[PDB]
Design a protein around this ligand. Sequence first.
Ligand SMILES: *[C@@H]1O[C@H](CO)[C@@H](O[C@@H]2O[C@H](CO)[C@@H](O)[C@H](O)[C@H]2NC(C)=O)[C@H](O)[C@H]1NC(C)=O
Ligand SMILES: *[C@@H]1O[C@H](CO)[C@@H](O)[C@H](O)[C@H]1NC(C)=O
Length: 495
Amino acid sequence: ARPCIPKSFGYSSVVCVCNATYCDSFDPPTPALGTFSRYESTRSGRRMELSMGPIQANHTGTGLLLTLQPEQKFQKVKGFGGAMTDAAALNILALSPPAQNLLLKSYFSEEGIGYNIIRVPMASCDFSIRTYTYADTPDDFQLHNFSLPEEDTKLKIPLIHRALQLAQRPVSLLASPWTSPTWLKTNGAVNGKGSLKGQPGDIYHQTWARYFVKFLDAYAEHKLQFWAVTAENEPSAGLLSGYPFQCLGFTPEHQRDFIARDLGPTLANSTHHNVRLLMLDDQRLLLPHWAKVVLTDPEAAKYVHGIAVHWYLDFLPAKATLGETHRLFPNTMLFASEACVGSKFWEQSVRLGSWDRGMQYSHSIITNLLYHVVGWTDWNLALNPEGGPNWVRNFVDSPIIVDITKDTFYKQPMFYHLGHFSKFIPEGSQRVGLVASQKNDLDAVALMHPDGSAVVVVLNRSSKDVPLTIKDPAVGFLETISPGYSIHTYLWRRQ
Ligand SMILES: *[C@@H]1O[C@H](CO)[C@@H](O[C@@H]2O[C@H](CO)[C@@H](O)[C@H](O)[C@H]2NC(C)=O)[C@H](O)[C@H]1NC(C)=O
Ligand SMILES: *[C@@H]1O[C@H](CO)[C@@H](O)[C@H](O)[C@H]1NC(C)=O
């Protein structure tokens, strides 16, 4: 174990300072039947502290009671992680090797928060320091000059390998393109309003479908295989006049037909047919309409494994989107493929120590779990103090901020708020019921670990301490209390 080295930067909480020779860490997971484990993080400085208490056989009183519903079974969990963008890899590798390993350990190791997903962009997005695709030779329909640049061969891929080496959980890779080569596009530019030329089934559309295959082929050459790909990052962006950075517009009908006609068959007839395809990969406000358009066409649906969703954590309904969508296509998983904060005009892109941005992460993770979402992926794994680099200056926050000049990195509250989920909810976990005995201000979600034991996260975004008890009929009652401005993960064995 190693405790947080705290440092204040003038906001509501501290960051934990890590460097080449030190970084906060866990002991390996260890609790007997009849006892419960509690991980606590507080605005006042506690960082996933471990403590244990007994489970009571009896309970008197009329304070808040949350009853576990073991037998109400909801979605199963895919996992948790972040994006290996050019900017993140760039920042990580600018540190000294020993510090690089602590950073990777904090995310990917049982000594850290056990991430098991990595989103990887296919070529450049806005967190890149130059625009480029894998096929920048014009009119190269055959993709003869398709190749991975150094951004993949010297930064992302090696970093990915090391993450996998460090992880004990099996890790899944997820890939998303921002833009195709510009000669495949009506506007001939990496950004701006513009889409694939011609129409689905045609040679522009076939070339693009093969580009996915070539991407996967090249990655498979560096011994990496993907769990899933998205059909396109924020397809809706490329429909917007003057959109500032890399994009490719699809209407839902364009996406439907492109999937049915080109990308589905192409992927299916290739050695990567077990790779899953997710559609949308955009704001949840495009639901349920996008889902309806794509899935009620059997020729497209037969290829679509799930629906990927984005969150701008600064803004903010979910039931009329996630809810309705799940209702309509219960067997098509919802998956959060991107989240983030740092745009509220009045506040810095990176606020070091921000407990509020922390709360925003887990509040969102919980709302997602409550609406059937099966996994959650943060945006940039790491960023500099300015919130980049980003070639369009589109800076934002990241759970780990790298300070190259001091060979230091900072773990923000956000990190720990993620940790309260990622570290304790392995793939296979199943969300189950948790009913409250009365209106309260807590946020809480309960799941069952594959092994049969229980996880419950309780978040408290008010300033008041909230005393409460959790009933599980198999074992008894957890008397506990939830400190204002805190998040707890509770674990206890069930048989
Ligand atoms: C990395 O950070 C660690 C932890 O803060 C630093 O080690 C501390 O250094 C100061 C000054 O030497 C001591 O007062 C503390 O007792 C140390 N803590 C521990 C547990 O060693 C170390 O200085 C940092 N490394 C660099 C290069 O700055
Ligand atoms: C494309 O590849 C060919 C052979 O594969 C190579 O000789 C040539 O330099 C490349 N053409 C361009 C435009 O780079």
